[PDB]
Amino acid sequence: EKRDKTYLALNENPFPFPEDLVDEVFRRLNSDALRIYYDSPDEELIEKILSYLDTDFLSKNNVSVGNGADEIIYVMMLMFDRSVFFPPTYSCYRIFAKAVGAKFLEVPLTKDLRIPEVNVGEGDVVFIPNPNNPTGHVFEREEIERILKTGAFVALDEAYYEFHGESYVDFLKKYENLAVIRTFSKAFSLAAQRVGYVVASEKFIDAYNRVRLPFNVSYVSQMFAKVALDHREIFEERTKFIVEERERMKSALREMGYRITDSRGNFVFVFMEKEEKERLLEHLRTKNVAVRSFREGVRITIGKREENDMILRELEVF
Amino acid sequence: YETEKRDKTYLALNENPFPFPEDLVDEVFRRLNSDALRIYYDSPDEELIEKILSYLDTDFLSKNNVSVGNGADEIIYVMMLMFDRSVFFPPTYSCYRIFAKAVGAKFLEVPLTKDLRIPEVNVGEGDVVFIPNPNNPTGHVFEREEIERILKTGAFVALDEAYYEFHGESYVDFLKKYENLAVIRTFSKAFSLAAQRVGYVVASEKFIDAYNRVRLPFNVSYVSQMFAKVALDHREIFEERTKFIVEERERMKSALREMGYRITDSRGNFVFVFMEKEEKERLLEHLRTKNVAVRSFREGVRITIGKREENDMILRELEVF
């Protein structure tokens, strides 16, 4: 419960799915297909995905799909002896591994938000959300190779790719124990239609395809992803801003005297308080505002310009 | 890719013979709020699960005894993740063994009697016995006492009612006495909505409680629920398609019996015809010859009920044998 319009606690894109494309979806959907068991990754869908990644080596067999980016996570943890992530990370990593009955190990990130040091090992799968959530910061070239080199299978959660220039999807030219997970939930405003895709070695995809549900991505959902991909410039325009807006109020918070993460996502992270923030959380609530409460600060999602200025205003009267 | 078999006449996946009501498609997109797509729509819809109850038509069931999944499959899937051991009896739904392995759960397969009866297996609490009913692929129906038996052992019963619409009854009114039971349904067969993956679980508030704690939070898409919702608000249309199919079935069974074939009392949207291998295969290559696909099983073939003209065709072929 509770969403009284001004909600910035789930990294949801502020803009609704373009009405235009909504009309192009079923002006393309056959009412006769709805009755059969529609091919999970659509042969067309993958092709358009390949173009999106715009690489010169991967093919059809290096890409698969999942009911939201969540399913890829959920299933991977089922196919590895142990899942290891580094808090502060995606709160679900913990929830999922606990529901799957999987073996996991949480190792706190360094005070500098650097990757910790611990075991390694083939048979393990370590999740590295990059840019990280909720901090939003980015991991350096080396830190990822560090784990890759241990033999352990790394799972790069690049859900916030769009809001950050590059993605290490080129490590697939040199590593087989890697996988790049992504989604349309944030940059394409399709969070409601659950559509995610992973990218790895051919050995992993079918290995993956054998564990995931046979038909996990609906016919209609699959259309939205294709439609959205053929009008990506539209969304690549919505991003330019979210970034301009983000990196704008970041300077605004640094001004108000707040300590923030060098977030590179569709959100900003205001640090450290707790009973100061558990306080401002009470302040924002009487203002219908809603951010994401964490340990070591709160994470706020970049909404519309009015919502953005909102945050700053209410954040200075504190 | 397993479904690479899509021929002019496909009756191998128990799919519905007609496309989703055209008009009804324009209604799901009529009440489709564009601003919802950008958000994480609530797992089950308050309205959706409101409708289901309506459908379920009962007095004891409440918004808490029901839940949804990405198609009946995910319900089975997560279920094998909750219990220590799953127990099913072949011939049964093929994905029970596939998912059990995939997920990595401990299973036990115990063959049904020669009379399609559930044998006595000392199962008990901690185990989850899957019992599709009507069964797949025989399509036969198990008796009250047959299920209530296992139920009294302590074991959990996953009564898969994926073919309820084609069979009058349902053991939903069992939750009144038992809690170690859960009924599973789907919109894929009766509502030509198999491409939108939507299913629902009916069980004790304590079970739904757990389940929801194991399934992905946002497993059913906004539009998917939308399709299920409008579909339910016009069930009438579908009730008719179901009427047709069962009639088209019983008709098909009688024609087959007369032809001297050994069939089952299928109460689903398909017919099962036993065939002694070396004669069965001739039939397959003969059908694959006439561009016809039917699911092949150990004891015979499962023929899905299609459009009037398709069924008539099937009857014509099985006659020349």
Curated annotation (Swiss-Prot), chain A:
N6-(pyridoxal phosphate)lysine modifications at: 186
Catalysed reactions, as listed in the record: L-histidinol phosphate + 2-oxoglutarate = 3-(imidazol-4-yl)-2-oxopropyl phosphate + L-glutamate
A GO MF term: protein homodimerization activity
Keyword terms: Amino-acid biosynthesis, Aminotransferase, Histidine biosynthesis, Pyridoxal phosphate, Transferase
InterPro entries reported for this sequence: Aminotrans_II_pyridoxalP_BS, Aminotransferase_I/II_large, HisP_aminotrans, HistidinolP_aminotransfase, PyrdxlP-dep_Trfase, PyrdxlP-dep_Trfase_major, PyrdxlP-dep_Trfase_small
Source domain of life: Bacteria
Keyword Calcium: no
EC number(s) given by UniProt: 2.6.1.9
GO biological process: L-histidine biosynthetic process
Known cofactor(s): pyridoxal 5'-phosphate
Enzyme class: transferase
Biological or metabolic pathway of the protein: Amino-acid biosynthesis; L-histidine biosynthesis; L-histidine from 5-phospho-alpha-D-ribose 1-diphosphate: step 7/9
Pfam families for the chain: Aminotran_1_2 (PF00155)
Subunit composition and interactions: Homodimer.
Family according to the record: Belongs to the class-II pyridoxal-phosphate-dependent aminotransferase family. Histidinol-phosphate aminotransferase subfamily.
Entry protein name: Histidinol-phosphate aminotransferase
Organism: Thermotoga maritima (strain ATCC 43589 / DSM 3109 / JCM 10099 / NBRC 100826 / MSB8)
Swiss-Prot record, chain B:
Amino-acid biosynthesis keyword on record: yes
GO terms for MF: histidinol-phosphate transaminase activity; protein homodimerization activity; pyridoxal phosphate binding
Enzyme Commission designation: 2.6.1.9
Enzymatic reactions: L-histidinol phosphate + 2-oxoglutarate = 3-(imidazol-4-yl)-2-oxopropyl phosphate + L-glutamate
Pathway: Amino-acid biosynthesis; L-histidine biosynthesis; L-histidine from 5-phospho-alpha-D-ribose 1-diphosphate: step 7/9
Top enzyme category: transferase
GO terms of biological process kind: L-histidine biosynthetic process
Entry keyword Chaperone: no
Keyword entries, A-Z: Amino-acid biosynthesis, Aminotransferase, Histidine biosynthesis, Pyridoxal phosphate, Transferase
CDD domains to which the protein is assigned, alphabetical: AAT_like
Modified positions (N6-(pyridoxal phosphate)lysine) in chain numbering: 189
Needed cofactors: pyridoxal 5'-phosphate
PANTHER family found in the cross-reference section: HISTIDINOL-PHOSPHATE AMINOTRANSFERASE, HISTIDINOL-PHOSPHATE AMINOTRANSFERASE 2
Family: Belongs to the class-II pyridoxal-phosphate-dependent aminotransferase family. Histidinol-phosphate aminotransferase subfamily.
Subunit structure: Homodimer.
Protein name as catalogued: Histidinol-phosphate aminotransferase
Gene behind this protein: hisC
